[PDB]
């Protein structure tokens, strides 16, 4: 038999974990038990940077990474996680599949032994607050908690809010006492962190569209037979379709859940937000020296 090892930061019960278990079941079935998958959840083998390194060394076979997460290693890949560049997951897939994406993936493979097999939708970030955000104009004066992450601050700063750095474990409290007026994160995190208990409004700002790439060790890849390569590729794409639909379904259920909790859900016009990001887009392209963001946004 062939037993592959898959590591992930996501804990048990998450969509990312449930899809990996589905992947495990699909590989076993399609190969009649010749290919097995062992799962190491909850970052038990280290964080994403550590697990990606083990793939480079061939000590771990598969892990998750966001397309934009490649920016730590390949600066231009950060373009895809700049706020408002990707309108939705389909748009993000075109970026992944484009010549730009193909260029990024070739570099991932050549330098780091990372073979990106697929991209799976993993949610879109939204904005909660203690007062309704009906338009961009309402961000003025908003004490907005963002993580210590470049692109989240830029969303906050260029939106007209007042970015208010703060460690993630303190946020529930800061929201309760209005020390901070709001925060931004994907819908599953808002539920998991119980942020809906201390925020009366949710704005569907759709400011960051997330994915998860499924990455295989090239050392592992090159030892597999041609047929086993085909089984893995087809299993990953099949599970990916299911994962994307699950996340989409879960997103609709979560807004309905929060609304059923009394949350006021707003849908501000997003074009003024996209326009407001052009300073960031121009700085990124000027600093990097190529018109990447403009091409991606129209792709």
What is the Cα–Cα distance from 5 to 12, expressed in whole angstroms?
A: 16
What total number of domains does the chain contain? Answer: 1
What is the Cα–Cα distance from 82 to 276, expressed in whole angstroms?
A: 12
CA distances from 188 to 13, 84, 131 (A): 11, 20, 21
For residue 75, the enclosing domain spans 1-299
Count of beta carbons in the 10 Å neighbourhood of residue 223: 11
What is the Cα–Cα distance from 93 to 91, expressed in whole angstroms?
A: 5
DSSP 176: H
Cβ-proximal residues to 200 (8 Å cutoff; 6+ apart), any chain: 130, 131, 262, 263, 264
- Method of structure determination: X-ray
Q: Work out the burial of residue 90: count CB atoms within 10 Å of its CB; fewer than 13 is exposed, 13-18 middle, 19 or more buried.
A: exposed
What is the Cα–Cα distance from 163 to 48, expressed in whole angstroms?
A: 26
What is the Cα–Cα distance from 212 to 123, expressed in whole angstroms?
A: 10
Output the 3-class SS for 18-61. HHHHHHHHHHHHHCCCCEEEEEECCCCCCCHHHHHHHHHHCCCC
Q: CATH code at 102?
A: 3.40.190.170
CA nearest to 66, candidates 13, 119, 138, 106: 119
Q: Work out the burial of residue 119: count CB atoms within 10 Å of its CB; fewer than 13 is exposed, 13-18 middle, 19 or more buried.
A: buried
CA nearest to 25, candidates 39, 45, 43, 12: 39
Q: What is the CA radius of gyration of the chain?
A: 20
User: What is the resolution of the experimental data for this entry, in Å?
Assistant: 2.1
What is the Cα–Cα distance from 166 to 180, expressed in whole angstroms?
A: 9
């Amino acid at each position: 038999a062939t037993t592959l090892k898959m590591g992930m930061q996501a804990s048990v019960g998450s969509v990312e974990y449930n899809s990996a278990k589905m992947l495990a079941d699909t590989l076993e079935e399609m190969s009649q038990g010749e290919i097995k998958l062992a799962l190491y959840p909850s970052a038990q083998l280290g964080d994403d940077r550590a697990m990606l390194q083990c793939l480079t060394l061939g000590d771990l076979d598969i892990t998750y990474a966001e397309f934009g997460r490649m920016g730590l290693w390949i600066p231009r890949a950060e373009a895809v996680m700049l706020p408002y560049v990707a309108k939705d997951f389909d748009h993000l897939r075109r970026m992944f599949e484009s010549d730009f994406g193909q260029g990024v993936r070739d570099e991932m493979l050549q330098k780091f032994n990372w073979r990106a097999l697929d991209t799976w939708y993993n949610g879109t970030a939204e904005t909660t607050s203690n007062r309704p955000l009906n338009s961009i104009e309402d961000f003025k004066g908003l004490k907005l908690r963002v993580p210590n992450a470049k692109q989240n601050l830029n969303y906050a700063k260029l939106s007209g809010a007042s970015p208010t750095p703060m460690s993630f474990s303190e946020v529930y409290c800061a929201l309760q006492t209005n020390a901070v007026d709001g925060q931004e994160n994907p819908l599953p995190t808002i539920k998991t962190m119980k942020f809906y208990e201390v925020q009366k409004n949710l704005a569907m700002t759709h400011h960051i569209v997330n994915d998860q790439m499924v990455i295989i060790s090239e050392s592992t890849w090159q030892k597999l037979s041609d047929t086993d390569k085909d089984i893995i590729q087809k299993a990953v794409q099949k599970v990916g379709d299911a994962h994307t639909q699950t996340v989409k379904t879960q997103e609709a259920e979560l807004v309905s859940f929060f609304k059923s909790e009394g949350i006021n859900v707003t849908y501000p016009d997003l074009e003024p937000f996209r326009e407001a990001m052009q300073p960031l887009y121009k700085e990124f392209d000027s600093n990097i020296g190529q018109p990447i963001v403009s091409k991606l946004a129209a792709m």
